[PDB]
C-alpha cells in the first residue's frame, strides 16, 4: 500500500503520439511513492504510475482532450499545457 509522492518532478522530454509522452525524474527521499498525476476527459494510459528511485526516470503516457497536465502536487507541481 504505497503513498503519494511529496517531492517534485523534473521534466526531460515531452513528445506527441493521439497521445502524449512525458519523461520525468524524481527529486525526493520518500520513494517508492505513488505519482500524483492529474489533468486540469483526461486519462492516464500508464497504469499505477510509481517512482521507485530518485536516479531512475519514469515514463508517463497520457491521453488529454486546451488544458494543463499536472504531474506532482503542492507548491511544486509540474504544470504543463497541451492540445
Amino acid at each position, epitope marked *: 500500500s504505497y*503513498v*503519494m509522492c511529496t517531492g517534485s518532478f523534473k521534466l526531460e522530454k515531452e513528445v506527441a503520439e493521439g497521445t502524449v509522452l512525458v519523461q520525468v525524474k524524481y527529486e525526493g*527521499t520518500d520513494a517508492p511513492c505513488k505519482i500524483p498525476f492529474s489533468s486540469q476527459n483526461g486519462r492516464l494510459i500508464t497504469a499505477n504510475p510509481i517512482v521507485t528511485d530518485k536516479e531512475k526516470p519514469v515514463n508517463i503516457e497520457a491521453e488529454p482532450p486546451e488544458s494543463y497536465i499536472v504531474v506532482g502536487a*503542492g*507548491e*511544486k507541481a509540474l504544470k504543463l499545457s497541451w492540445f
Partner: antibody
Amino acid sequence: EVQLLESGGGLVQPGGSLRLTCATSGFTFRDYAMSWVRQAPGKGLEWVSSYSGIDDSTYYADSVKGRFTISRDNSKSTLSLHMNSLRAEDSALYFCAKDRGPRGVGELFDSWGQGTLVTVSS
Amino acid sequence: DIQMTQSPSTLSASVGDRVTITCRASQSISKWLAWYQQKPGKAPKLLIYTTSTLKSGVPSRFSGSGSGTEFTLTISSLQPDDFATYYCQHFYSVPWTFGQGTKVEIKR
C-alpha cells in the same frame, strides 16, 4: 478568517495514550492537507505528521512512526492525532497547521493554531 | 533525513541595520525552502516560501535568496516588531525538517 483550535492536551503517564483534535472554521477542510507540528520547551520546531489533500496519504516523522496516527473528519472539519505508547520526549506544545494551498501534501504550514500542551510524566 | 543548520544561533543588531541569517542543508533541496518567524508566546508565521516568494502581508524589508545548499534570509531595515526566532524549513520531501532557530536581538 482561517482559525484553528487544538484541544485534548494534558498530563499522561508514560506508555499511555491521548487524542488531540483540531477544530477548523474558515476554509474548505476537504481540499487542504493538514499537519501536526510540535515544539518542546526552549527548543525548535519538529514536524509530527501530515494528512494529504488529494487522498488518504499519511506521513509520519521517524521518531513517531508506528505510535501516532493522524485522522481526518471532513464532516466536522476536524483533524485528530491519536498518540499511543507516549514517551518522555513526546512532551511538547502540539500545533495544528494548514497547508498554504489546496490539493497538496502538507509542504508548508501557512496557518497555525495556538497549540495544546502535552506533558508525559509519571 | 535532510538536516538543516542555521547560522548564527543568536544575533544582536540595532533597529535600522541590515541583518542576515543563513541556512545550510545537508543535501541540495533545489529552491524548496521556506522561512517562518515565531514571536515569543505566539505560533510561527510563514514569511517566505520557495526561497524568495513573499507571503502576502509580509513587509518588503524581508527577502530570501540563495539556492541549492546555502540560503539566506535578509531584513533590510530592522524594525520594532521584528524581534523573534526565525526558522527555515525545507519542503523538498518528507520528512519535513527545520533548522535549530536563530533568535535575533534588538540592540540598545
